[PDB]
Write an enzyme that holds these catalytic residues in place. Structure first.
Site, PDB file in Angstrom:
ATOM      1  N   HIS A 121      14.592  16.270  64.140  1.00  0.00           N
ATOM      2  CA  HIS A 121      15.198  14.930  64.259  1.00  0.00           C
ATOM      3  C   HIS A 121      14.304  13.787  64.677  1.00  0.00           C
ATOM      4  O   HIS A 121      14.719  12.670  64.604  1.00  0.00           O
ATOM      5  CB  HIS A 121      16.427  15.004  65.054  1.00  0.00           C
ATOM      6  CG  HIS A 121      16.219  14.993  66.530  1.00  0.00           C
ATOM      7  ND1 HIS A 121      16.776  15.917  67.348  1.00  0.00           N
ATOM      8  CD2 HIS A 121      15.570  14.140  67.333  1.00  0.00           C
ATOM      9  CE1 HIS A 121      16.459  15.658  68.590  1.00  0.00           C
ATOM     10  NE2 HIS A 121      15.729  14.582  68.610  1.00  0.00           N
ATOM     11  N   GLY A 134      13.942  10.569  75.712  1.00  0.00           N
ATOM     12  CA  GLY A 134      12.530  10.863  75.611  1.00  0.00           C
ATOM     13  C   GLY A 134      12.168  12.299  75.952  1.00  0.00           C
ATOM     14  O   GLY A 134      11.015  12.702  75.764  1.00  0.00           O
ATOM     15  N   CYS A 144      13.428  15.068  74.506  1.00  0.00           N
ATOM     16  CA  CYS A 144      13.504  16.010  73.402  1.00  0.00           C
ATOM     17  C   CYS A 144      12.135  16.590  73.106  1.00  0.00           C
ATOM     18  O   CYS A 144      11.121  15.888  73.161  1.00  0.00           O
ATOM     19  CB  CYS A 144      14.074  15.331  72.164  1.00  0.00           C
ATOM     20  SG  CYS A 144      15.854  15.117  72.324  1.00  0.00           S
TER      21      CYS A 144
END
Ligand SMILES: *[C@](O)(C(=O)NCCc1ccccc1)[C@H](C[C@@H]1CCNC1=O)NC(=O)[C@@H]1CCCN1C(=O)COc1ccc(Cl)cc1Cl
Ligand SMILES: *[C@](O)(C(=O)NCCc1ccccc1)[C@H](C[C@@H]1CCNC1=O)NC(=O)[C@@H]1CCCN1C(=O)COc1ccc(Cl)cc1Cl
Ligand SMILES: [Cl-]
Ligand SMILES: [Cl-]
Ligand code: NA
Lengths: 305, 306
Positions: free
Chosen positions: A41, A143, A145
Site C-alpha cells: 500500500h 508513519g 507502517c
C-alpha cells in the site's frame, strides 16, 4: 528475581530498517540481502485506498517510482514485484548488516517483539502477543507502517510481523513477511473491526507459574481438576480451550514448582469464579496472558542472544 | 493509538557490552571508547563481601588479572582505576561501535530502558523507573551485575544506571556511571533494606492524560482541588507530594487535552477513593506510575481523540 515484560534486543533488526517513499507516501521497509520489503500500500493514493487494484497500480509503476533511503544513503531500486500484500524492491546493494534470519508465520498466543519505526528510524521496542482474534495490542501512529515484529533464537532472527493498519478499537493488524494477513483483514480504507477477543489460557497458566517462581503463592490451593471440567469453566469466561498439548508444554514449570498443570488450573478456576479479593499477582490486578511458557522459562533462566 | 511500556531500541548499547572476569568472578562491563566500566565488586572473593576494603583489594591486582572479552575477542587491559563503586579498565582498543553518549544521574520518578545482559551477551530490554526509595523493580538474575540503564533521546545515549545488587524484597539497586549509588545503599553484603516506597504522583497524572489522548474520559469529574488539598489526600494513599514543578511539567499535556492540571488531580483523588469499578484505564486495573510526562509526549499522538 523479578518478572518484567521483556523484548528481545533489537540491534540486529535496527540495521535493516529503511525508509521507502512512493509519490507522497512514506513508510518503513526491511532491507535484507538485496531486497527491501514493505507494505504494498505504499503505491496507493488515498483515492486508491478506498478500492485499490494493486495489480493495475503496480504494473503502472516502475523502479524509479521508489525512493529507498538507508540512513542518509539512497539505495537504487533495480526491480520490483509483489508477493501477496508485501512489495519486494530489489536494490543494487546487499545490506552488509543483514543478520542470519528466517521468515516465519506465528500462531495465536505466540509473542514477539515489535520495533516501532518512523521514516526508517527505530523509535521504540516492546513485546506483543498475536491475539486469538489475530490483532495485536500495539502502539502505532501514522508513519509506522512497515514496522516489523520478530523473535531471536541464538543469532537467528525470525521475522513474523509487518505492520499495516489500525482498527477502530485501537488495536493493530498486519501480515507475515510473505504478505499474508493475520486475521480476516484487507489492506483497504474500508469498514473493518476486531472480532470478540478471548484470553490465552496457556499463557495465563505460564504467568501463574512465573508468579510462584517469584514467591507469589496466595492463589495456590489443595484442589485439582480435569481438562474437561476446566475447559467448561474456560468457555464460560471467554478463555481459549486448554489442550493436552498445552499441558505438555507447561510440563517443565509444573515439575519445578510442584504444582501440576491441573493443580494450577484449579487455582485459575477459583480466580475466575471468585476474583482476586483485592490482591495482586506479580504486581497486576488482572490475569496476564501475553507471556508464553517459553517466555517464562527464558526469563527465569537468563537465556542470552 | 495504543499505549505500551516502550523501551528504546537497544542496538547502540548492545555493541558496548562485554564480559569482565577477575578471579572466579564474571559480570558484564560497558565498553566506551578505550574504557570498560564495571562494578568494582568484580574484584571480591567469598570471604570479602561483608566488609571489603576495595582500596586494599585493588592495589593487589595487575592489569593482566582482568580478562575482558568482547564477543570472541580478548581485550588487553593496560590500566585501571576506581571511581566510587565503579572500576574503570583502560584497554588498548577503542570500541569502534561506541555511540554518541553522555553520563547522567537521574532523579526519582525518571524512567529508563534496561538491557539485561549475562556474560556480556544481551538477554532482553525493558523499561524501569527510579522509585522514590531509590530502587528499581527489575528482572535480574545472578550474573546480571554490570547491565546498564539508558535513554536515547535524539540519537544520544544517556547512561544513567549500572546494576549492582538485589535487596531482600526482590527489588534492585545500583549506581550512576560515575559509581555513586542511588539511595543509601552500599556494595557490601551487610544487612540493607529498601525504605517504604511511594507512588510517583506526577507520572500517574501523565498516564491519565495519555488515557484522555487515546480517547477515554470516564474517570473525569466536575470538580477541582487546591494543590495543598490534593497533597493532603494523596499522602493518605502513600502517594508522593505533587510540587509546583510537577504542575508546570504537566502543562503541555494539559494544553493538548484541555484539562487543567488541578482538574486532573481531582480525577485522581476520586479514583483513589473509588477504585475503577471493574473498568480499566489503558488496559490496566491499577493506576500506573512508570510513565513520565516526557514519556507520554514521546509515545502519544499530538492530536487528542475527542
Ligand atoms: C500506515 O498506512 C502508515 O503508517 N501510513 C503512512 C503512509 C501512507 C500509507 C497509505 C496511504 C497514505 C499514506 C497506517 C498506520 C496506522 C495509522 C494510525 N496507526 C496505524 O497503525 N495504516 C493506515 O493508515 C491504514 C491504511 C488504510 C487504513 N489504515 C488504517 O490504519 C485504518 O485506521 C486508521 C488510520 C489512521 C488513523 Cl489516525 C487511525 C486509524 Cl484507526
Ligand atoms: C551481581 O553482583 C552479580 O551479577 N554477581 C555475579 C558476579 C559476582 C561478583 C561478586 C561476588 C559474587 C558474584 C549480583 C546480582 C544479583 C543476584 C540476584 N539478582 C541480582 O540482581 N549481585 C549480588 O549478588 C550482590 C553483591 C552483594 C550482595 N548482592 C545481592 O544482590 C544481595 O542479594 C542477593 C544475592 C544473590 C542472590 Cl542469588 C539473591 C539475592 Cl536477593
Ligand atoms: Cl531526571
Ligand atoms: Cl493491572
Ligand atoms: Na490447586
Amino acid at each position: 528475581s523479578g518478572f518484567r515484560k521483556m523484548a528481545f534486543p533489537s540491534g540486529k533488526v535496527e540495521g535493516c530498517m529503511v525508509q521507502v517513499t512512493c509519490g507522497t507516501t512514506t513508510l518503513n521497509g526491511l532491507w535484507l540481502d538485496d531486497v527491501v520489503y514493505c507494505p504494498r500500500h505504499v503505491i496507493c493514493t488515498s483515492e486508491d485506498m478506498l478500492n485499490p487494484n494493486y495489480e493495475d497500480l503496480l504494473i503502472r509503476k516502475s523502479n524509479h517510482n521508489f525512493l529507498v533511503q538507508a540512513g542518509n544513503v539512497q539505495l537504487r531500486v533495480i526491480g520490483h514485484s509483489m508477493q501477496n500484500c508485501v512489495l519486494k524492491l530489489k536494490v543494487d546493494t546487499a545490506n552488509p548488516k543483514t543478520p542470519k534470519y528466517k521468515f516465519v508465520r506465528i500462531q495465536p498466543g505466540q509473542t514477539f517483539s515489535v520495533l516501532a519505526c518512523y521514516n526508517g528510524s527505530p523509535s521504540g521496542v516492546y513485546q506483543c502477543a498475536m491475539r486469538p482474534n489475530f490483532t495485536i495490542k500495539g502502539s502505532f501512529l501514522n508513519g509506522s507502517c512497515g514496522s516489523v515484529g520478530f523473535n531471536i533464537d541464538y543469532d537467528c532472527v525470525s521475522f513474523c510481523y509487518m505492520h499495516h493498519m489500525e482498527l477502530p478499537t485501537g488495536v493493530h493488524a498486519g501480515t507475515d513477511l510473505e504478505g499474508n494477513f493475520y486475521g480476516p483483514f484487507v489492506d483497504r480504507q474500508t469498514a473493518q473491526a476486531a472480532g470478540t477477543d478471548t484470553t490465552i489460557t496457556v499463557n495465563v497458566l505460564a504467568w501463574l507459574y512465573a508468579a510462584v517462581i517469584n514467591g507469589d503463592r496466595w492463589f495456590l490451593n489443595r484442589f485439582t481438576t480435569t481438562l474437561n471440567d476446566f475447559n467448561l469453566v474456560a468457555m464460560k469466561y471467554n478463555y481459549e480451550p486448554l489442550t493436552q498439548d498445552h499441558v505438555d508444554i507447561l510440563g517443565p514449570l509444573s515439575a519445578q514448582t510442584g504444582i501440576a498443570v491441573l493443580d494450577m488450573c484449579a487455582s485459575l478456576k477459583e480466580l475466575l469464579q471468585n476474583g482476586m479479593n483485592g490482591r495482586t499477582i506479580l504486581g497486576s490486578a488482572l490475569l496476564e496472558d501475553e507471556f508464553t511458557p517459553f517466555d517464562v522459562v527464558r526469563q527465569c533462566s537468563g537465556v542470552t542472544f
